[PDB]
From a paper:
Here we show that components of a (PUL) from Bacteroides caccae have activities consistent with comprising a unique pathway for depolymerization of chondroitin sulfate, a common GAG. After prior desulfation by an endo-sulfatase, BcSulf, to produce unsulfated chondroitin from chondroitin sulfate, the depolymerization pathway begins with the activity of a polysaccharide lyase from family 35, BcPL35. BcPL35 activity is coupled with BcGH88, an exo-β-uronyl hydrolase, and presumably BcGH109, a confirmed α/β-N-acetylgalactosaminidase. The most unique feature of the pathway is a β-D-glucuronate dehydratase, BcGDH, which we show through structural and functional analyses primes saturated non-reducing end β-D-glucuronate residues for hydrolysis by BcGH88.
To trap a substrate complex, we crystallized the inactive R285 A mutant and soaked crystals in chondrosine. The structure comprising a BcGDH tetramer in the asymmetric unit was refined in the spacegroup P212121 to 2.6 Å resolution. Electron density in the active site was clear and allowed modeling of the disaccharide. The loop containing Y175 was modeled in two conformations. In one conformation the tyrosine sidechain is oriented out of the active site and makes interactions with another monomer in the tetramer. The other conformation is one where the sidechain of Y175 moves over the active site to interact with the galactosamine residue. The structure of the trapped substrate on the inactive BcGDH R285 A mutant overlaid with the unliganded structure to estimate the position of R285 provides unique insight into the mechanism of this enzyme. Y289 is positioned in proximity to the O4 of the glucuronic acid and may act as a catalytic acid. The catalytic base is slightly more ambiguous as Y229 or R285 may perform the role of abstracting a proton from C5 of the glucuronic acid. However, Y229 is nearer the C5 proton and thus we propose it is more likely to perform the role.
Author numbering:
A (entry chain A), B (entry chain D), C (entry chain C): 21 to 405
D (entry chain B): 19 to 405
The structure:
């Protein structure tokens, strides 16, 4: 039905619908005032100290590739530029000690996680979202990222979060902790179990956290370590090839009706279950059996199944606790309204230009859709790397 | 739409459509003459020595619980008594040296696999499928199961097959290889990676072999080792809970349209991907937030999406290579027509009586269906056991 | 003080003091009649079913290389011929059910250990101790080794014993168990911990069992599997190289006074603690900076510290429970008089001819002797292989 | 005859511990350690070594003499020697971080200071009242900053992790800023590296050498002790390392030969009797196992002490340690070993930190295990443990 160009307009519309309340309010210093703090228990204490950074860091981590595109004068180009300026205005506010939207980095341990997503935003759009900020704003982000070191010894997983962050400071040529990078890189490698899956900690689990955290961030950390001879091209390649393998499962779990199963912890992160697939696509490294077009069509179906209606939004435009609908019963205890903005992490292909094959090739059936209609189903097999 | 009593009727109709060509031809001694030998390459050499025992063992492993029921006068009862007699007659012919449907145990290593599935049939229905056999037939199977030690080894993902087969021999009071049972038990425990998942051999894959082989056989073997103190109630509970946890994911991977992802090796085994769910349901051990009726309805959707139409059958009603359609391009090199009769393994809940709540309870949306329409969605989390 | 030629005359004399009471009695049919059964508890029930095969198989495995030499007219050459002939005679009585000295292979699991040692004798001197046996005697040994499989014994550190035994059956072209060879080969490798040390079981231990069993039997098993493509040359070099490393520690723990530490389990096996050193010496594969002569002089000092006097012998010339003297308190509960004939296992260098540099090169201090007196001391360091 | 008493044995250990350690301690007090201490290396090069070897001499020396100095003062001839040497130590410790002093020690250059700061920290942990508390507050703060400046050179070798962990636990104990993450990682990596029967691996690679005595056991236990009161390491963990050390000491006590030698094997045999720090530490804690008595440990290590220090074969013409094992044998020195490196030799004298009236020093002579076994005496059965 819809074309690649129409698909892009859909993604733009849905990505705007998710991310704009976060970005715009931060730009107006009203994010604390206007964003709900919805929790399963209903308690806001504790949550209120951490939830805004989660919203900013997760929102920008997903919109960043789109905003890294060169400006132009298309109807989309206007939107990209309007969004980017509001983002930069927001980031100055988030570290301005005088702004009512100043973001917490010191109370609680949770800031470790979401500074990593804010760093991923920067690593995905450095020329668009980091460099234009003024030097005092840059310094505050440098100091805020460094201040996280008094809590990083905490949760076993969360190791990679602070590795990503320290490798960000290494790549910005300021003080960084070699130890936290060596430990986290080496532990993520040890946590590989096979066939494109790590464990997020000592015990393996079948959940979406390989796409939520592990694959995208390990590659991004290793890329930072490479130029300084801290990681080798061989272990960058090994992590990259493992993300490419993990994406095959993610593409294959999209059903013919454009749904995907709800399993494991934090199903409230919705389409961030596909960040592995989305990152691989943005890097033009999709597996050989998978055409870009079928990734665009599958994720377009998932996107409109989950964000075109308002089942996942409240009366003022914010994401509500749930999976597809208002389902607070499925939210983990650490989840609040801010954490839900993991939703953006499937929209990374927007960082491909509008003239990329991914957005221009004719519609294509994705794997499961071919499988169930008697079409060409490729053989799949475990990999040993 | 349909009621539980209709769902039972559909399952019987569809299990009949899968297994009757195999059981009837073997009973009449024309299984070799009539059954196709389809392969991805088109060659029949090698395959023709092993494909028939594949069809017989794989089929019986799945239909055995249904045939363990006591006899009734009802229409369904007439079907059961009729099918059971043809299995008994076919089992006689299969080790009769004069019958043209003599099956191969002695050439190649592959009879190791399929002897284990045939053993499983005997294990799931001893009084209905084993005790009625004549003494000569009994000793012939005992001898041929013992002749399999000659090939053995690979130390890999066939090891659990021989462990099941030697545990059968132990349960029957005959000579058996204690070392093979011990190595299979300890190695399968050591291959547990977590959250209900084993690795099949020393290599983790994300595929259906946990359903195809691991959970159902490990539990069945331990149950054979329990009476004689070769396994403990502790390690049996361990495997039982591991299978139950695994079933949680399989139930959740049924999409609202009654489909499920195609991923990993041997996707050609179709609904065998749900044996772990089917075995748990038969044992009345579904995790208590997963109702028996919603398992019945979910697998009714999968069962007729794959078997009610003929996209998976040739002109004579045999299974063909593929997933949903004739798709020989998804088949593994080792796969042939008889391999496909794994398809029976999701029908084990027909071993539950017609008045069991599994077949009599109200219609119920399975987990994905509720999740995507905005109904209750039970939170999930990784387990440590 | 003493020359190489005299050193050899001492090894022959002391080896004769140890091995002849076992060998001569077995040849005369009087081993059961004459050999004591000494135990820490003083009990003999149970021990009396197994101690005799312990004595034979442990004794032969140490004298075998000496007996593999070709005959000559020298004072020492006449002794080899006399001993080999008594060994052949004893071996025929051993499986002769008319002989009073028919050894037990059927009661208890212990036969697994000592059959393996008996097998090691044959492997070290095939031409001299196996090939001259009559055909009925050869077949009885084949049946006796095969009849052990019913007793796994588990213990998991008896795996190498059955693996060596089975690989001996393969080496003779008769029916062997593949599975047992494969599992024992792969387990010992899994049990490598580093730096020339295996763990003899799940956990590492600092004891002499690496020299009692692991290295010599692992190298010997692999050498059997090499012709039949059953193990690669690379995994034979690996095991060989690990033994050569281990021998360095054993060479170095011989103190300047010709003692060595008493430590770990089963110190009652006495100079068998040097079996890896002795086997490396026999194979002319000592490392660069370990002279063959210094191994000769180091082991000569140990050999007469323990065997020249009578502290370790009883009034009848049999080994007694102890380290150096009658010290039954250090015996394991499973140990009896027969167990003690592991003491032959440091005498393998007599498998080198008298004209070999090991026996003709002039005296030389050993590593600890040189170091404590101030001479050259080569840098040691851990190895990675 | 040749068999000494317990009172004599303590005197011999004082004489010998004094022969090793007084050149280092007295020169640092005088401020002439850089001037006078040799810098001996197998190659002969001094570049790089001269930046690290002085802290090596200081930290290693102090970690071995520290228990002796923890004893309260008295007016015996030995109590005089402790008072004098202690006061020189506090003098040398002031010079060591005086920017004015010429014996100022390096903490900024190279990675090696991580190692030797840890040994110095271990002296402080073994005699807090005697070597740390009497320091002026300026000198104390200076040490704190030097220990904290070690984090910028980090993410170093597989091993060395225990060193930084002990250091960070020391800063934890003093109530000053510490890196909790470096503590969490070194506690857990060491727990993962246990292979069994009393042996860790020093990093991912297992090796049969004396580094379980050199570093592993004493610093693991000493680190967990700092972690216990602070709700950061359980009694279960601390007793676990403690029993593992007691098991390790059984092998080390057993490897002493009847003639009073021990085998040279594995890396850095140049550390000489540091191969007995595990035995020495367990003897000092009075947690020897049931079948090894304090007397046989004293007598065994008295034989070892004077087989290597009574004579001058390990000393140069000025009383400095030379490269080797028992003699001038520089060919067994690793490339990282200098003259400072060799003052690990003090770590076997920990039992001098038991008072002169302890059973360790008062009980009659007693053969040690190997000595008893080779002459036909009681030999206790050994067996691998599972803990
Ligand atoms: N609160 C702990 C929990 O923290 C959660 O971790 C997530 C992750 O990526 O691991 C992150 O997405 C989320 O924002 C954060 O709240 C997590 O550490 C688990 C597992 O140890 O335990 C919870 O106590
Ligand atoms: N024939 C080999 C093949 O064996 C296949 O293994 C499957 C399994 O359990 O993994 C089993 O379901 C199937 O019936 C059996 O044919 C397989 O082991 C592959 C590699 O895994 O190599 C083939 O030679
Ligand atoms: N009897 C068991 C005991 O067997 C002993 O094992 C030794 C070995 O090689 O492991 C062997 O040298 C000796 O002949 C044999 O008697 C031992 O396996 C221990 C530990 O598993 O348990 C005892 O019951
Ligand atoms: N410089 C490296 C070297 O450092 C040495 O480590 C020793 C240890 O504990 O392993 C320590 O005793 C010594 O003071 C220190 O200089 C060592 O890490 C080795 C590792 O093989 O490599 C050397 O480059």
């Amino acid at each position: 039905q819809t074309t690649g160009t129409q698909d892009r307009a859909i993604w733009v519309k849905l990505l705007w619908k998710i991310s704009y309340p976060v970005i715009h309010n931060l730009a107006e210093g009203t994010l604390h005032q206007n964003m709900p703090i919805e929790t399963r228990s209903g308690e806001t204490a504790g949550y209120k100290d951490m939830t805004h950074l989660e919203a900013v860091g997760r929102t920008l981590a997903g919109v960043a590739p789109w905003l890294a595109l060169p400006d132009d004068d298309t109807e989309e180009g206007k939107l990209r530029k309007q969004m980017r300026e509001e983002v930069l205005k927001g980031l100055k506010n988030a570290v301005d000690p005088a702004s009512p939207d100043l973001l917490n980095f010191t109370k609680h341990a949770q800031p470790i996680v979401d500074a990593a997503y804010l760093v991923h935003a920067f690593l995905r759009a450095p020329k668009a979202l980091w460099e234009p900020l003024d030097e005092v704003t840059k310094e505050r982000y440098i100091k805020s990222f460094q201040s996280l070191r008094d809590r990083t010894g905490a949760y076993n997983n969360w190791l990679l979060f602070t590795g990503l962050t320290e490798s960000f400071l290494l790549g910005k040529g300021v003080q960084y902790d070699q130890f936290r990078i060596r430990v986290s890189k080496n532990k993520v490698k040890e946590w590989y179990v096979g066939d494109g899956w790590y464990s997020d900690g000592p015990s393996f689990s079948m959940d979406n956290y390989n796409a939520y955290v592990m694959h995208s961030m390990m590659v991004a950390m290793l890329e930072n370590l490479l130029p300084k001879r801290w990681a080798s091209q061989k272990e960058l390649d090994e992590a990259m090839n493992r993300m490419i393998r993990h994406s095959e499962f993610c593409e294959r779990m999209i059903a013919p009706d454009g749904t995907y199963p709800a399993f494991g912890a934090s199903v409230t992160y919705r389409t961030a279950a596909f960040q592995s697939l989305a990152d691989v696509a943005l890097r033009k490294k999709l597996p050989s059996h998978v055409s870009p077009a079928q990734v665009r069509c599958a994720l377009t179906a998932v996107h409109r199944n989950m964000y075109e209606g308002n089942q996942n939004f409240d009366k003022d435009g914010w994401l509500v606790l749930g999976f597809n609908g208002h389902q607070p019963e499925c939210a983990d205890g650490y989840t609040s309204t801010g954490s839900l903005y993991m939703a953006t992490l499937s929209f990374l292909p927007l960082g491909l230009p509008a003239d990329d094959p991914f957005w221009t090739d004719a519609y294509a059936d994705w794997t499961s859709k071919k499988a169930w209609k008697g079409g060409h189903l490729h053989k799949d097999y475990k990999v040993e790397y």
